[PDB]
């Protein structure tokens, strides 16, 4: 009894699979659904087009090819989640055999009325990662909603930009725009509601979700969004030197000429795997291939667009984890789990070198930072010194851009909800002294403890993890269903609405509570005090 | 006609392998002297060789990218000619490897940055470089040198003791393009990769972001409806009935103003008004309460039996009707009509009637909205004699 679903491009045969938990019902899934034309040959480096139609019943039983990527090549480890980097061998099972024809998605249907739709966009880095590694079957059956995991052009193929008509760039985000267009017109057959679509991403993917809300094209596609440990305001969110790294790649493949047109046509002649095998190391804590400002998809600065009110239409839920910048200090930590004073001052000096690029009066900010993140209640503590040093990278890269995004959205009474994750699972993937790192909220959103330890998450969960994950899944589905995390299914705790004056957030953890002004002492430091010491523009 | 005269002869440059080299050659005369670049090199290319003609027809800028030793290193001449004369000037290029670069050579400290600026506000492109001797700062806009010799124009050359940059006072669409800076002294010339500049900014009249959508519910059923308006600067959002403002105006919100409909009774056209210093917009909402059906058409007696009567009637309503209620009773009796319920067709035969008795039949249209007015009645004539 295979399930049959009609679409605007042909019929698809899926499979009814029951979940291992007796409490959760069976779900219908349809894998490898083409939502756009193959971006090969001439379609390469071009906006996505609608997919070709098929006459018969197309098999949606096997996995589709992933986009060209390579994890063994040197990529910035700090951007990737730790569960990705701790198990590189397990991840390699999903990345094997990549093909340029990779524009396919996956849908999950739980089996009254139209069912809400949730669209996921995973982002390890802007070069790797895929939605196939995440199984949203638990979130589908638990919340009676539709979970969608997709793939999109990544790396050079999805973000090559020459800043002119030869290669506008932002091809990866356009694939996510095309997917949501196809989902909006074809999910009604799956029993889904196109008006209750909630796109949600994590990590770099959450940075992608933030960009889509600012796009002019996403107007009538979705209505809600959930951003998890990502932002369009980080240093790696937008590439502000794309022509430089693009021309460096063209010299590596030999296609570097003077006309940007002659070299783009030259690149399409090259194979898609020769471009990925090439390694390009950008400026540290910056991205070499990513989204650009093209004057169309991203017309202006992201923060500039937020003041315009572009994304006030959609209901927004966002938040960050406790210790996101684990890999920053992990190399400096001694075998005694401590950071020395010389190592602390050294790591702080490295921070000012990379992000701010040697301004005049730079020595003023090194000692200002060292004063801010030093617990004067315990000056000589090496472990506390490690604790505040992780909070340094965590505040500036994730916490600062997230609060600025939440204030610019809740500025005019638009529905906004903010959370803070303070719980992580226990395994050998990450050291025990470390807290919730990048991508640690992913399992609790999809209900991984409901199934147990997996090949990708060898964590040893407890009964408190299943209770917490069911709470998290209920908040997510409730928000995707009604725009309110508390309606219609209550918790068996009330999540208050966020506004820039009260700044009410939800402390997510084994002791769920509601506090105010999350880390607000450090937030105003980076937003108000830091730029004024960077505004040495008095010479002009 | 005037023979061509050189106005800006090319100077010999010295570029880096993998970089750029730009020569400048301009002339004047009558007619316009066309320029032909004739490289006298043993190895010639075409993909790197691109000539960029000036937008005003003065001269052309030869560009070679990327520089590769020793093929690009040759002698280049600028032949400006017309149908009156012919002149030529040669310049030399010097391309060296990555290691031949000595101490104090022009090194780009900070390259040009991506930036977006306002139409009338000041645009500033920054570029830092250091060398021994101190190199000279020159900018290139779309493979063309940036002319900043005139101080009266909007474009100005910022030159501080530390570093100099480029400043634009009032921006136009012309400024939108690729900008690249490069340092040059007696040692050589080393470029930095370009940085695109965009000039489009925030001062747009308000637009309806979430327009009010019309609805229909049974009267009484309260509902919270949303109207959102965006733009820079953010406009005041006001709900208006068309005569009086529903909002207190004193503390009217900005950006979003959801309207609460209490004690829904009659339909009405609501108007969400969003006004700003730039413009004012209006949006209408067709709030329509579900109305009752009009009385059906007059029925007609089709079949006249002694104990039964068949009737056919018109719906009388442009909207569909759920069912029809037949109301039968004696002619002049003041008794409440005995009603037949559940009739799903426009024709029904009433059974059980006592013979030779004049009856009165009424058809009732009822939908999900409620029971509409009764149709017009009729009478038939059956008579028996004893
Ligand atoms: C789909 O797969 C089944 C077996 O899994 C096979 O019998 C059938 O022919 C396939 N159909 C198509 C259109 O490939
Ligand atoms: C694995 O689970 C056991 C519970 O039986 C726990 O004691 C142990 O700490 C877990 N492993 C790690 C690495 O935490
Ligand atoms: C008014 O809008 C709020 C939005 O949170 C909603 O909770 C409430 O139910 C609405 N009231 C009515 C009467 O619909
Ligand atoms: C709304 O306006 C239209 C045309 O302006 C008019 O025909 C209609 O009757 C109005 N509706 C109400 C409820 O006044």
Task: Write the secondary structure of B98-125 as one string of H (helix), E (strand) and C (coil).
Answer: CCCCCCCCCEEEECCCCEECCCCCCEEE
Q: Do B200 and A240 touch (CB under 8 A)?
A: no
Q: What strands lie across the sheet with B155-159, from one edge to the other?
A: B123-125, B164-168, B155-159
> Do residues B57 and B71 make contact, with C-beta atoms less than 8 angstroms apart?
no
Q: What is the CA radius of gyration of chain B?
A: 44
| Ligand closest in space to the Cα of A462 | 2
Rounded to 5°, angle at Cα B153 from B148 and B154: 95
Give CA separation, B53 vs A260, A269, A519, B33, B37, in Å: 17, 30, 57, 12, 12
Q: Which residues precede a break in chain A, with C-to-N distance above 2.5 Å?
A: 111, 492
Nearest CA among A217, A311, A480 for reference residue B255: A311
Alpha-carbon distance of A510 to B109, in angstroms, equals: 50
Alpha-carbon distance of B160 to B163, in angstroms, equals: 5
* Phi, psi (degrees; rounded to nearest 5) at B290: -65, 120
Q: Does A240 touch chain B (CB under 8 A)?
A: yes
Strand segments, DSSP code E, in A382-512 are: 416-421, 504-508
Tell me the H-state helices in B65-222.
none
For A462, residues 6+ apart whose C-beta sits below 8 A from its C-beta are none
Nearest Cβ partner of B210 from A244, A251, A313?
A: A313
Residues listed for chain A:
540
Give CA separation, B271 vs A397, B205, B237, in Å: 44, 18, 11
Alpha-carbon distance of B289 to B52, in angstroms, equals: 68
Q: Do B255 and A414 touch (CB under 8 A)?
A: yes
CA dihedral A287, A293, A298, A302 (to 10 degrees): 70
Alpha-carbon distance of A360 to A2, in angstroms, equals: 68
- CA A456 from chain centre, in angstroms, equals 18
Rounded to the nearest angstrom, the minimum Cα separation between A297 and chain B is 13
* Phi, psi (degrees; rounded to nearest 5) at A185: -100, 0
**Pairing mode, if any, of strands A27-34 and A15-17?**
antiparallel
Residue spans in chain B of domains classed CATH 2.60.40.10: 2-96, 107-198, 204-287, 298-380
Q: Is the CB of B223 under 6 A from ligand 3?
A: yes
B255: left (phi over 0), alpha (psi -120 to 50) or beta: left
Name the 3-class secondary structure at B291: coil
DSSP code, position B197: E
On the CB side of B368, CA atoms within 13 Å amount to 8
Alpha-carbon distance of A496 to A507, in angstroms, equals: 11
CA B260–ligand 3 middle distance (angstroms): 8
- CA A260 from chain centre, in angstroms, equals 31
**Residue A400: its H or E element:** helix A400-409
Alpha-carbon distance of B349 to A409, in angstroms, equals: 66
Q: Relative to the CA of A426, which ligand 2 atom is closest?
A: 14
DSSP code, position A270: S
* Phi, psi (degrees; rounded to nearest 5) at A537: -90, 15
Rounded to the nearest angstrom, the minimum Cα separation between B375 and chain A is 38
Q: Is the CB of B262 under 6 A from ligand 3?
A: no
For A532, residues 6+ apart whose C-beta sits below 8 A from its C-beta are none
Q: Does A257 touch chain B (CB under 8 A)?
A: yes
**Helices and strands (H, E) in chain B, number of each type:** 0, 34
CA A427–ligand 2 middle distance (angstroms): 7
Nearest Cβ partner of B209 from A241, A244, A312?
A: A312
B-chain CB neighbours of A163 within 8 Å are 178, 194, 196
Tokens of residue B8, six digits: 């800006």
Measured by CA distance, the residue closest to atom 6 of ligand 3 is B224
Domain positions in chain A are 1-540
Query: Residue A93 class from Cβ within 10 Å (0-12 exposed, 13-18 middle, 19+ buried)?
Result: exposed
| Ligand closest in space to the Cα of A496 | 3
Determine which of A166, A235, A258 to mutate to test the interface with B (most B C-beta atoms within 10 Å): A258
For A93, residues 6+ apart whose C-beta sits below 8 A from its C-beta are none
Nearest CA among A353, A127, A161 for reference residue A242: A161
Alpha-carbon dihedral sign for residues A259, A260, A262, A263: positive
Alpha-carbon distance of B361 to B313, in angstroms, equals: 11
Q: Spell out the CATH class of B298-380.
A: mainly beta
Q: Roughly how many angstroms between the first and final C-alpha of chain B, as a whole number? A: 131
Q: At what angle do helices A341-356 and A363-372 cross, to 10 degrees?
A: 130
Nearest CA among A389, A396, A395 for reference residue A375: A389
Alpha-carbon distance of A52 to A49, in angstroms, equals: 9
> Do residues B37 and B78 make contact, with C-beta atoms less than 8 angstroms apart?
yes
Alpha-carbon distance of A464 to A467, in angstroms, equals: 5
Tokens of residue B244, six digits: 């009086």
CA dihedral A84, A399, A496, A312 (to 10 degrees): -90
Name the 3-class secondary structure at A491: coil
DSSP code, position A238: S
> Do residues B65 and A262 make contact, with C-beta atoms less than 8 angstroms apart?
no
Residue located via tokens 């050291």: A431
Rounded to the nearest angstrom, the minimum Cα separation between A240 and chain B is 5
B-chain CB neighbours of A411 within 8 Å are 255
Alpha-carbon distance of B74 to B69, in angstroms, equals: 10
A-chain CB neighbours of B47 within 8 Å are 257-259, 262
> Do residues A126 and A153 make contact, with C-beta atoms less than 8 angstroms apart?
no
Rounded to the nearest angstrom, the minimum Cα separation between A523 and chain B is 25
> Do residues A221 and A177 make contact, with C-beta atoms less than 8 angstroms apart?
yes
Q: Do A256 and B66 touch (CB under 8 A)?
A: yes
Q: Spell out the CATH class of B204-287.
A: mainly beta
Residue located via tokens 């501080």: B160
* Phi, psi (degrees; rounded to nearest 5) at B228: -125, 135
Q: Do A258 and B162 touch (CB under 8 A)?
A: no
Name the 3-class secondary structure at B240: strand
Which superfamily does B107-198 belong to? Immunoglobulins (2.60.40.10)
Q: Is the CB of A427 under 6 A from ligand 2?
A: yes
Q: Do A412 and B256 touch (CB under 8 A)?
A: yes
Resolution for this model in angstroms, one decimal place?
3.8
CA A59–ligand 1 middle distance (angstroms): 6
Rounded to the nearest angstrom, the minimum Cα separation between A255 and chain B is 10
CA B227–ligand 3 middle distance (angstroms): 14
A-chain CB neighbours of B178 within 8 Å are 163-164, 243
Alpha-carbon distance of B235 to A317, in angstroms, equals: 25
What are the residues of chain B with a beta carbon less than 8 Å away from any beta carbon of chain A?
Answer: 18, 47-50, 63-66, 109-111, 113-114, 116, 124, 158, 160, 162, 167, 178, 193-196, 198, 200-202, 204, 209-210, 228, 230-232, 234, 253-256
- CA B142 from chain centre, in angstroms, equals 27
For A60, residues 6+ apart whose C-beta sits below 8 A from its C-beta are A12, A13, A14, A30, A31, A32, A33
Q: Does A361 touch chain B (CB under 8 A)?
A: no
Residue located via tokens 């006030």: A312
Q: At what angle do helices A260-269 and A242-253 cross, to 10 degrees?
A: 50
Alpha-carbon distance of A103 to A95, in angstroms, equals: 15
Q: Do A295 and B114 touch (CB under 8 A)?
A: no
Rounded to 5°, angle at Cα A61 from A59 and A63: 115
Q: Is the CB of B224 under 6 A from ligand 3?
A: yes
A195: left (phi over 0), alpha (psi -120 to 50) or beta: alpha
Alpha-carbon distance of B163 to A10, in angstroms, equals: 63
Nearest Cβ partner of A412 from B49, B158, B234?
A: B234
On the CB side of A237, CA atoms within 13 Å amount to 23
> Do residues B232 and A335 make contact, with C-beta atoms less than 8 angstroms apart?
no
Rounded to 5°, angle at Cα A458 from A452 and A462: 50
A387: left (phi over 0), alpha (psi -120 to 50) or beta: alpha
Q: Do A308 and B210 touch (CB under 8 A)?
A: no
Technique employed here was: X-ray
For the beta carbon of residue B250, count every other beta carbon within 10 angstroms: 5
Nearest CA among A410, A417, A398 for reference residue A309: A410
Alpha-carbon distance of B184 to B282, in angstroms, equals: 59
Q: Relative to the CA of A58, which ligand 1 atom is closest?
A: 13
Q: Spell out the CATH class of B2-96.
A: mainly beta
For B174, residues 6+ apart whose C-beta sits below 8 A from its C-beta are none
Alpha-carbon distance of A154 to A160, in angstroms, equals: 10
> Do residues A410 and A498 make contact, with C-beta atoms less than 8 angstroms apart?
yes
Name the 3-class secondary structure at A385: helix
């Amino acid at each position: 009894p295979a399930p049959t679903v009609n679409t605007h491009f042909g019929k698809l045969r899926g499979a009814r699979v029951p979940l291992p938990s007796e409490i959760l019902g069976p779900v219908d899934q349809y894998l490898g659904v083409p939502y756009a034309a193959p971006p090969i040959g001439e379609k390469r480096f071009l906006p996505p087009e609608p997919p070709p139609s098929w006459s018969g019943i197309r098999n949606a039983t096997h996995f589709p090819p992933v986009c060209p990527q390579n994890i063994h090549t040197a990529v910035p480890e700090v951007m990737l989640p730790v569960w990705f980097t701790a198990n590189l061998d397990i991840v390699a099972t999903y990345i094997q055999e990549p093909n340029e024809d990779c524009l396919y998605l996956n849908v999950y249907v739980p089996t009254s009325g139209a069912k809400p739709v949730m669209v996921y966009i995973h982002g390890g880095s802007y070069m790797e990662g895929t939605g196939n590694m995440i199984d949203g079957s638990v979130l589908a059956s638990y919340g009676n909603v539709i979970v969608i995991t997709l793939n999109y052009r990544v790396g050079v193929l999805g973000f090559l930009s020459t800043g002119d008509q030869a290669a506008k760039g932002n091809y990866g985000l356009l694939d996510q725009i095309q997917a949501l267009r196809w989902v909006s017109e074809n999910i009604a057959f799956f029993g889904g509601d196109p008006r209750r679509i909630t796109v949600f991403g994590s990590g770099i993917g959450a940075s992608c979700v933030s960009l889509l809300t600012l796009s002019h094209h996403s107007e009538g596609l979705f209505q809600r969004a959930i951003i998890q440990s990502g932002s369009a305001l980080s240093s790696w969110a937008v590439n502000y030197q794309p022509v430089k790294y693009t021309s460096l790649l063209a010299d590596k493949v030999g296609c570097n000429v003077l006309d940007t047109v002659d070299m783009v046509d030259c690149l399409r002649q090259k194979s898609a795997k020769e471009l990925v095998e090439q390694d390009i190391q950008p400026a540290r804590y910056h991205v070499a291939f990513g989204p650009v400002i093209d004057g169309d998809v991203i017309p202006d600065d992201p923060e500039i667009l937020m003041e315009q009110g572009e994304f006030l239409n959609y209901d927004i839920m966002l938040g960050v984890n406790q210790g996101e910048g684990l890999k920053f200090v992990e190399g400096v930590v001694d075998p005694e789990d401590g950071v020395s004073g010389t190592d602390f001052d050294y790591s702080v000096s490295n921070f000012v070198d990379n992000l701010y690029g040697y301004p005049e009066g730079k020595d003023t900010l090194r000692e200002t930072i060292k004063f801010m993140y030093t617990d004067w209640a315990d000056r000589d503590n090496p472990e506390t010194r490690r604790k505040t040093l992780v909070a340094l990278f965590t505040d500036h890269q994730w916490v600062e851009p997230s609060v600025v995004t939440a204030d610019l959205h809740a500025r005019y009474g638009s529905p906004t909800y903010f959370y803070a994750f303070y719980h992580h699972c226990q395994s050998l993937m990450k050291p025990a002294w470390s807290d919730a790192a990048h991508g640690d909220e992913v399992p609790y959103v999809f209900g991984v403890p409901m199934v147990g330890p997996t090949d990708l998450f060898p964590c040893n969960f407890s009964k408190n993890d299943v209770m917490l994950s069911a709470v998290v899944m209920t908040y997510w589905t409730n928000f995707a269903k009604t725009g309110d995390p508390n309606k219609p299914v209550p918790q068996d705790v009330a999540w208050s609405k966020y506004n820039p004056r009260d700044q009410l957030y939800l402390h997510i953890g084994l002791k769920p509570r509601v506090r105010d002004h999350y880390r607000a002492t450090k937030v105003a430091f980076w937003k108000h005090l830091v730029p004024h010491l960077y505004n040495l523009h008095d010479m002009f | 006609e005037t023979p061509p005269r050189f106005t800006r002869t090319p100077v010999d440059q010295t570029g880096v392998s993998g970089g750029v080299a730009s020569f400048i050659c301009q002339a004047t005369g009558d007619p316009r002297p066309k320029i032909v670049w004739n490289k006298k090199g043993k190895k010639v290319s075409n993909q790197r060789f691109e000539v960029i003609e000036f937008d005003d027809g003065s001269g052309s800028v030869l560009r070679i990218q990327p520089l590769r030793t020793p093929r690009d290193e040759a002698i280049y001449e600028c032949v400006a000619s017309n149908n009156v004369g012919e002149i030529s000037v040669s310049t030399r290029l010097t391309v060296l490897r990555e290691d031949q670069i000595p101490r104090g050579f022009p090194t780009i400290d900070m390259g040009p940055q991506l930036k977006v600026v306002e139409r009338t506000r000041t645009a500033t492109m920054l570029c830092a470089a250091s060398g021994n001797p101190d190199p000279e700062i020159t900018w290139f806009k779309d493979f063309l040198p940036v002319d900043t010799s005139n101080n009266n124009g909007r474009i100005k050359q910022l030159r501080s003791e530390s570093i100099g940059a480029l400043q634009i006072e009032q921006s136009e669409e012309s400024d939108q393009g690729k900008y690249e800076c490069v340092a040059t002294n007696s040692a050589g010339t080393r470029y930095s990769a370009p940085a695109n500049l965009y000039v489009r900014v925030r001062r747009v009249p308000p637009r309806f972001s979430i327009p009010p959508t019309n609805h229909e519910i049974m009267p009484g059923g309260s509902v919270n409806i949303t109207c959102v308006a965006v733009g820079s600067p953010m406009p005041y959002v006001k709900w208006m009935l068309g005569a009086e403002d529903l909002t207190p105006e004193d503390d009217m919100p900005i950006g979003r103003n959801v309207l609460e409909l209490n004690d829904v009774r009659q339909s009405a056209n609501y108007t969400c008004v969003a006004m700003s210093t730039l413009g004012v917009i209006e949006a209408i909402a067709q709030i329509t309460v579900k109305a009752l059906p009009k009385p059906p058409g007059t029925p007609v007696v089709t079949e006249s039996t002694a104990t039964s009567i068949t009737l056919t009637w018109d719906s009388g309503n442009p909207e569909p009707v759920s069912y029809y209620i037949i109301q039968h009773k004696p002619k002049n009796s003041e008794e409440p009509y005995k009603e037949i319920d559940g009739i799903a067709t426009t024709r029904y035969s009433v059974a059980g009637l006592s013979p030779y008795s004049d009856y009165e039949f009424r058809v009732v249209a009822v939908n999900n909205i409620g029971r509409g007015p009764a149709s017009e009645p009729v009478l038939t004539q059956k008579h028996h004699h004893h």
